[PDB]
């Protein structure tokens, strides 16, 4: 289609291809919604290829793509308004990922990223995450948002809130964490879980629709890896790192006591101890402002000084007036 | 009932004083049902109307109030109603620096794990409090720790020892807002909010590093914000900017089961 | 331990004025300034531009260089001490005219415009701001001393005088008093223009110093001495 | 001894007057000026705001007349905004009046050198780095950069080395002219400083640091 | 510990009729800053508002300020009295002509 309708071939091909850019994005998202567990390979060979074509289309048809991308965000919000999580689908997760491919994620303001980030922060929070399907959906969401800030490394409070409830959810309460609001108490992992077998931490998208303990563990393992990565990159830089990590530290302590064999929390805990030791937690001082100068004001002057019209009439009267007496005299 | 009690019920009763025991019991409700944990928030409004109208009292009001502030407050849809009442209570002229300092430090602590909508509420709310009670500038900044180029080498050595020996004295578990030692602490939490992902929120947090020229901010311009309003607002932006791209290229958006955009995520 | 100021916003330090004598400040007198006007249009008489006319006036053109005066005020006015509002500037024209330079002023950098300002000050006796709020340059009544602070130290620039460290000189000096420095804007002449008012004459460097250079050295000296930065 | 670009071992103050607005325009070639030549510069398409060779003029007066130059410990380089590098011999004595000062540079820019009967002013080939001493510290004046004591800076700094200060004579512009050559930028005062004032501020510190007096 | 004053806190600044009036200044001479409002007109408005003139502009309670707004916007309704609410170049040329004729006399 692109070759048949290149801009040079005819006038008006640019708008057709630009409209086609919007059309192609919906198809890429559309295919992900369709079931593909049967021919995951063939889907993988179509899905990535179509993204590459959009990348070429985006390079010249950005405005068409950006308009469509914003439209999907509004549609996603509208569907979330009535269906809540039921609106959310695999293609929705895919859609955010493609925006990351094609658009500059780490900007203070962007047309599509700034909406896209706040949509995911929404999904990170009001979504109750009371099902392993929903928790896995959030785990994918955490990875997407964490990468949008791979360079900015800005602070997302929802990531902090999301981790705490998910971390506590799998130990259900221990009676020492009443400040964290859980939405499910039946997802607590069994004590018999080995936590020494090599369980794959990769979460396939297609498994999400199908969705036990290993699935619970696999979802849990990925979340810490996101948690551990964020500590090293974002939270470490923040001035309030200690306050951010204290509730996480307490939750991580629960894993080690309950599951001694489980090593991931201990590695994070050992790392967290290292960061707090080096960081010098000193009272901030931000109101130290540079002194202000005395006022400076420009002089008022005429470039060529002279040592309204009614006033001149008066002076010329006086001169003309004055002369008259001397003749009269 | 509690939501409409203050407005559509009290003014129409002949002897509204009869409601207090219902309201005080409501304000003192503690239950294992989490959905009942919001009851003191709603009951507070009706209780204050009775106290205002007939000069009626609730014991240890601020100490009970300090307890009600919790992370759940930042996420309930009734957050906006609560803070409006907080403005009135914390506008009192007989409030000690320590009492105000505790409300400051706890709220800043809660903002770390708060929705931006709540953060948008707190950042002006705190500026009003700090402005009202000037003694609390210690928590934003303490001049003792500032370094001057002119300071002698001995002063440099003394300053170094002071930095080493500092410890945060603020206690999170103390329920008496006068004893938390917040005034001796600092608001590291607000500084982190300067790096908030949302640009407009970060600019609000940036205000604390700026001179406190403004006298106050209208809370009602800040209270009833939801993400959907943030979504409607960004779409209805006054200024339109050209979209930008990523020169960096990823071969695969998702990881397998060359360049992978989302390692740890596969189809 | 002390409670902080209620408002921490930086506020401009007060603009020093002749009426106030208590405050510590650095005074500098640009003596022997050659500022003269004459109708051709009244132009600030210049050593190079108007050589024949000054010959007709009979005044030696060598001492007809207002550029030296202009340069001194430029480095003086733009010094940090002025911007910090602990410096006020006095100019004694060679004819005998005393001028006040309000620290707030911002003169033009181009000399041609500066000549435009000087002719007017001599004629109107004053200069008013663009916003019309304060009189930047004002001619005043001699002698200088009444305008000088009540407790004050006076020094002149003499190449022959012993060389002294300005930082040391200010540091050893008291705090309630004030310091005047008499700088000779004249290109060449005997350093006795301010002998009658000064109590002692000091040198800054073994090598000869220009008026613009010498004052700039001193203002630094006070700024390091006073922790002005 | 008169310091020269050829000699690199000796410790000295180098001052680089960057972004110098020195240009000759023929309607006869004359130095372009903000006020004298407004319409002509408009025809050239160049904004009149950054058309002040006087700012460069004042800086040379204070630099050349500084006692450190009299001590033979200072050499000046000028980077014209057009991209012309000019070496200023420490022995030169430029005219005090700006008109005569403009009259010299038209000869320099066209004749590429000024001779007395050593080149007092000579146009040199870029980059500026080659002329600089082999072991040398480089800094720019940056209002945004932290404020430092110039005296302490020279004191803490080594002796066999030399220090370069890149002064931007241009009225208003981003302080990135010398970002390529410099290794750090330093603030001199919390307050604004004019180019003439700033380089005057630096030279005294060198005078105090080395006791040139 | 809980004291709330009905009248309200002192206001350093107020906004009235799209103009920032310094609450510091007295009411009459804070309102005179309002364009079209003079000292005497401001006095008239203040007295009709039943607002004591000795008060500062900061202290004002809401209802009286709203009353003042109503007074200004609706003067006639509250019975404010109505009374309270080239050729030269030609003459120059003629003078010049007379001057020229006068020169002609001589």
């Amino acid at each position: 289609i692109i070759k048949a309708y290149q801009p040079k071939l005819a006038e008006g091909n640019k708008e057709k291809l630009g409209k086609f850019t919007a059309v192609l994005l919906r198809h890429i998202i559309f295919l992900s919604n369709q079931n593909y567990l049967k021919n995951v390979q063939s889907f993988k060979r179509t899905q990535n290829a179509l993204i590459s074509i959009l990348k070429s289309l985006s390079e010249k048809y950005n405005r068409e793509l950006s308009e469509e991308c914003r439209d999907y965000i509004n549609e996603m919000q509208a569907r979330y308004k009535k269906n809540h999580f039921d609106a959310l689908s695999n293609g929705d997760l895919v859609f955010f990922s493609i925006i990351g491919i094609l658009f500059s994620t780490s900007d203070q303001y962007h047309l599509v990223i700034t909406p896209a980030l706040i949509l995911m922060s929404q999904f990170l929070e009001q979504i109750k995450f009371n099902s392993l399907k929903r928790i896995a959906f959030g785990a994918v969401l955490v990875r997407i948002v964490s990468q949008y800030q791979r360079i900015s490394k800005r602070y997302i409070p929802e990531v902090v809130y999301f981790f705490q409830k998910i971390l506590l959810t799998f130990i259900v309460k221990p009676l020492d964490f009443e400040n964290i609001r859980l939405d499910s108490y039946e997802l607590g992992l069994p004590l018999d879980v080995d936590f020494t077998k090599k369980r794959s931490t990769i979460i396939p998208l297609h498994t999400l629709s199908t969705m036990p303990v290993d699935q619970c563990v696999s979802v849990l393992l990925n979340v810490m890896e996101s948690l551990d990565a964020t500590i090293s990159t974002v939270w470490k830089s923040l001035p309030a790192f200690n306050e951010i990590i204290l509730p996480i530290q307490q939750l991580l302590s629960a894993y080690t006591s309950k599951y001694s064999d489980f090593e991931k929390p201990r590695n994070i805990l050992n790392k967290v101890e290292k960061l707090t030791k080096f960081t010098e937690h000193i009272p901030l001082a931000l109101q130290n402002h540079k002194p202000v100068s005395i006022p400076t004001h420009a002089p008022k002057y005429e470039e060529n000084f002279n040592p309204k019209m009614k006033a001149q009439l008066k002076k010329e009267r006086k001169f003309t007036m004055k002369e008259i007496r001397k003749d009269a005299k | 009932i509690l939501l409409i009690l203050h407005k559509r019920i009290i003014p129409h009763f002949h002897t509204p004083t009869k409601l207090m025991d219902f309201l005080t019991d409501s304000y003192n409700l503690q239950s294992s049902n989490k959905n009942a944990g919001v009851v003191p928030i709603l009951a507070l409004n009706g209780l204050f109307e009775l106290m205002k109208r007939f000069n009626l009292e609730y014991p240890n009001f601020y100490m009970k109030l300090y307890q009600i502030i919790n992370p759940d407050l930042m996420h309930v849809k009734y957050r906006a109603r609560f803070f409006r009442l907080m403005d009135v209570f914390l506008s009192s002229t007989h409030l000690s620096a320590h009492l105000v300092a505790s409300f400051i430090k706890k709220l800043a602590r809660l903002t770390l794990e708060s929705p931006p909508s709540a953060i948008v509420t707190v950042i002006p709310f705190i500026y009003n409090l700090i402005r009202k009670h000037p003694n609390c500038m210690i928590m934003l900044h303490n001049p003792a720790f500032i370094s001057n180029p002119f300071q002698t080498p001995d002063q440099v050595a003394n300053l170094k020892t002071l930095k080493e020996n500092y410890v945060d004295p603020f206690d999170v578990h103390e329920s008496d807002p006068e004893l938390t030692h917040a005034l001796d602490s600092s608001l590291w939490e607000l500084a982190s909010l300067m790096e908030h992902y949302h640009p407009n929120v970060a600019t609000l947090a940036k205000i604390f590093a700026q001179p406190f020229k403004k006298l106050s901010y209208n809370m009602e311009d800040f209270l009833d914000w939801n993400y959907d309003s943030l979504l409607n607002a960004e779409s209805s932006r006054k200024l339109k900017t050209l979209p930008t791209l990523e020169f960096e290229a990823f071969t695969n958006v998702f990881d397998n089961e060359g360049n992978v955009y989302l390692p740890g995520v596969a189809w | 331990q002390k409670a902080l100021p209620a408002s921490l916003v930086p506020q401009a330090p007060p603009v020093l004025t002749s009426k106030d004598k208590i405050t510590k400040r650095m005074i500098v007198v640009l003596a022997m300034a050659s500022l003269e006007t004459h109708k051709i249009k009244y132009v600030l008489l210049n050593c190079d531009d108007h050589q024949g006319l000054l010959k007709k006036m009979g005044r030696d053109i060598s001492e007809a260089r207002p550029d030296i005066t202009h340069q001194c005020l430029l480095t003086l006015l733009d010094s940090p001490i002025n911007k910090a509002g602990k410096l006020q500037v006095y100019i004694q024209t060679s004819r005998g005219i005393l001028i006040e330079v309000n620290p707030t002023v911002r003169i033009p950098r181009t000399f041609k415009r500066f000549s435009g300002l000087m002719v007017q000050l001599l004629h109107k006796l004053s200069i008013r701001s663009v916003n019309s709020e304060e009189k930047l340059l004002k001619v005043i009544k001699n002698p200088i001393t009444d305008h000088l602070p009540t407790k004050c130290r006076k020094v002149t620039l003499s190449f022959d005088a012993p060389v002294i460290r300005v930082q040391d000189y200010i540091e050893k000096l008291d705090d309630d008093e004030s310091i005047c420095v008499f700088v000779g804007a004249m290109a060449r002449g005997k350093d006795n223009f301010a002998d009658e008012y000064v109590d002692e004459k000091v040198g800054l460097s073994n090598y000869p110093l220009s008026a613009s250079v010498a004052c700039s050295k001193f203002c630094h000296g006070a700024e390091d001495a006073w922790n002005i930065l | 001894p008169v310091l020269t670009s050829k000699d690199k071992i000796t410790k000295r103050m180098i001052v680089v007057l960057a972004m110098a607005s020195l240009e000759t325009h023929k309607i006869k070639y004359v130095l372009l000026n903000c006020d004298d030549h407004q319409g002509l510069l408009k025809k050239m398409g160049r904004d009149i705001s950054e058309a002040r060779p006087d700012i460069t003029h004042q800086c040379l007066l204070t630099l050349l007349d500084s006692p450190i130059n009299k001590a033979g410990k200072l050499q000046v380089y000028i980077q014209t905004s057009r991209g012309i590098l000019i070496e200023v011999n420490p022995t030169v004595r430029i005219p005090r009046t700006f008109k005569r000062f403009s009259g010299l540079m038209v000869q320099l820019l066209h004749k590429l050198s000024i001779r007395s009967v050593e080149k007092l002013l000579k146009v040199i080939k870029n980059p500026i780095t080659d002329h600089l001493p082999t072991k040398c510290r480089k800094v720019t004046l940056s209002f945004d950069a932290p404020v430092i004591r110039v005296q302490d800076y020279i004191e803490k700094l080594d002796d066999d080395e030399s220090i370069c200060v890149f002064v931007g004579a241009m009225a208003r512009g981003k302080d990135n002219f010398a970002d390529e050559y410099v290794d750090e930028k330093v603030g001199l005062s919390n307050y604004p400083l004019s180019a003439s004032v700033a380089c005057s501020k630096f030279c005294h510190g060198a005078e105090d640091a080395w006791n040139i007096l | 510990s809980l004291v709330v004053q009905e009248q309200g806190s002192f206001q350093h600044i107020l906004r009235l009729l799209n103009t920032n009036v310094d609450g510091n200044i007295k009411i009459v001479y804070a309102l005179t800053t309002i364009k079209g409002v003079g000292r005497r007109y401001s006095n008239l408005v203040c007295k009709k508002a039943d607002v004591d003139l000795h008060k500062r502009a900061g202290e004002l309670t809401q209802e009286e300020l709203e009353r003042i707004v109503q007074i200004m916007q609706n003067p006639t309704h509250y019975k404010i009295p109505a009374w309270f609410l080239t050729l030269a170049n030609n003459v120059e040329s003629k003078l010049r002509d007379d001057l020229e004729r006068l020169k002609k006399i001589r």
Binding site: - | - | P108, V130 | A171, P192 | R15, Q62
Partner: peptide, 25 residues
Amino acid sequence: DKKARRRTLRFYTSRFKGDDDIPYK
């Protein structure tokens, strides 16, 4: 409630540097 206090708060609400040249005219 807010419409009421929204009315109330409405009453409540309300240098040359370096080498900068004086405004040319």
